Every structure is written in C-alpha cells, then in structure tokens.
Amino acid sequence: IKHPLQNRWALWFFKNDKSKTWQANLRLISKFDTVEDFWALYNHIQLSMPGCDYSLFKDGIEPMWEDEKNKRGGRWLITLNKQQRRSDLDRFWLETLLCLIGESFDDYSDDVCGAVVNVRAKGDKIAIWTTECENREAVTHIGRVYKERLGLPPKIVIGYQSHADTATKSKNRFVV
Ligand SMILES: Nc1ccc(C[C@H](NNc2nc(-c3ccc(Cl)c(Cl)c3)cs2)C(=O)O)cc1[N+](=O)[O-]
Numbered sequence: 776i777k778h779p780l781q782n783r784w785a786l787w788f789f790k791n792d793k794s795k796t797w798q799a800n801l802r803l804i805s806k807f808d809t810v811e812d813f814w815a816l817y818n819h820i821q822l823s824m825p826g827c828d829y830s831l832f833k834d835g836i837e838p839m840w841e842d843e844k845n846k847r848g849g850r851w852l853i854t855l856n857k858q859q860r861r862s863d864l865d866r867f868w869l870e871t872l873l874c875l876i877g878e879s880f881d882d883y884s885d886d887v888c889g890a891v892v893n894v895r896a897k898g899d900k901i902a903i904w905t906t907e908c909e910n911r912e913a914v915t916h917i918g919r920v921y922k923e924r925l926g927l928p929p930k931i932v933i934g935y936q937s938h939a940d941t942a943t944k945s946k947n948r949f950v951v
C-alpha cells in the first residue's frame with residue numbers, strides 16, 4: 776500500500792558546540808524508505824536552530840568527510856544571502872530533498888551521497904554531496920540539473936568543492 780523509494784535515507788542533526796570535537800555533535804535521527812514516511816517526517820519537523828545542520832544521506836553513509844563514500848567526494852554548494860532564509864530557504868531545501876529521494880539525476884543519482892543544510896548567521900548553505908570529485912561527467916550533470924531544478928539564474932555560478940580541499944582549507948573543482 777505504501778510507495779517505496781529507490782533508496783533508504785537517514786536524517787541527521789548537528790548541534791553547534793565549539794567545546795566539543797565535530798563528530799561528537801552529530802545525531803542520527805531516523806530513517807525511511809517510502810514516500811509516505813518521508814512526508815510524515817518532513818511535515819512533522821516543519822510543524823515542530825542557528826548553528827545547526829540537517830542532513831539527509833543514503834543509509835550507511837554518515838554525513839561527514841571521513842565516510843568511505845564521501846572521502847574522495849565533494850559537494851555542490853549553494854550559499855544563500857541573509858534575506859533568503861525567509862524567502863527561499865524552505866523551498867530550496869524541500870526541492871533538494873526531492874532531488875535526492877526522487878533520484879532526479881537519472882543514472883548519475885548513483886553518485887549522490889546526501890544533502891546538507893547549514894543554518895548560519897553569515898548566510899545559510901545548502902549542498903548536495905557526491906561520492907567522487909574527479910567524476911567530471913557525473914558531477915557536472917548533477918550540478919546542471921540541480922541548479923536548474925532550484926530555478927537559479929544562468930550567469931551566477933554555484934561551485935563544487937572537493938572535501939579533500941575543504942578539509943585542508945587555509946577553491947572549486949567545478950562551477951555551473
Ligand atoms: N548534538 C546534540 C546535542 C544535544 C541535543 C539536545 C537538544 N535539542 N534537541 C532537539 N531535538 C529536536 C528534535 C528532534 C527530532 C525531531 Cl523529529 C524533532 Cl521534530 C525535533 C529539536 S531540538 C539541545 O538543544 O541541547 C541535540 C543534539 N543534536 O545534534 O540533535
């Protein structure tokens with residue numbers, strides 16, 4: 776009676792706490808693998824924050840660089856301005872979630888690991904994480920479709936960063 780998704784997904788929370796090492800602040804909330812259970816979760820949280828993150832990742836992949844499926848990967852990063860938290864954040868996040876659970880990138884959705892939203896005073900961020908940063912055709916395909924899906928204007932780019940680079944930041948591998 777329920778409608779299965781192609782993948783099982785897990786929702787993670789992150790609570791900012793500078794007094795603790797980063798991994799200590801991560802919390803696995805719940806998992807789902809049907810359309811019905813996705814909306815049940817989404818609707819519940821909408822009815823029910825700064826410094827914190829939400830992450831939706833395929834089952835078995837933790838939302839961190841250290842994970843085997845993220846180690847060699849990277850992310851398409853969308854940076855919002857401060858006004859867009861009110862206007863665009865919720866729309867962008869839901870549209871991103873639907874890209875994930877609806878496998879919107881066709882054959883290349885296999886490269887998708889998950890998505891993360893950072894709530895930050897400096898400007899909120901939404902990102903789609905993929906598994907191999909050197910996989911140009913997959914990465915660029917995901918970027919092009921994702922940018923279009925969120926309705927972003929052509930000339931202004933979004934960037935793809937390697938996690939290996941982000942982890943050693945003291946730069947983009949791709950733009951779309
Ligand atoms: N790392 C960490 C450390 C401490 C806490 C506890 C705490 N807040 N917990 C909270 N849970 C929800 C919450 C959860 C699930 C659903 Cl379904 C809904 Cl509707 C709301 C909102 S607020 C606090 O403020 O100290 C939390 C975390 N963490 O990462 O989640």
Ligand SMILES: C[n+]1cn([C@@H]2O[C@H](COP(=O)(O)OP(=O)(O)O)[C@@H](O)[C@H]2O)c2nc(N)[nH]c(=O)c21
Pocket residue numbers: 797798838839840841893895
């Ligand atoms: C995604 N991520 C973030 N951090 C740590 O979290 C810090 C901030 O990460 P951020 O919250 O993504 O960026 P922000 O500066 O806008 O808040 C980074 O300097 C990293 O040290 C991370 N640390 C580990 N070990 N693994 C991760 O996946 C990871």
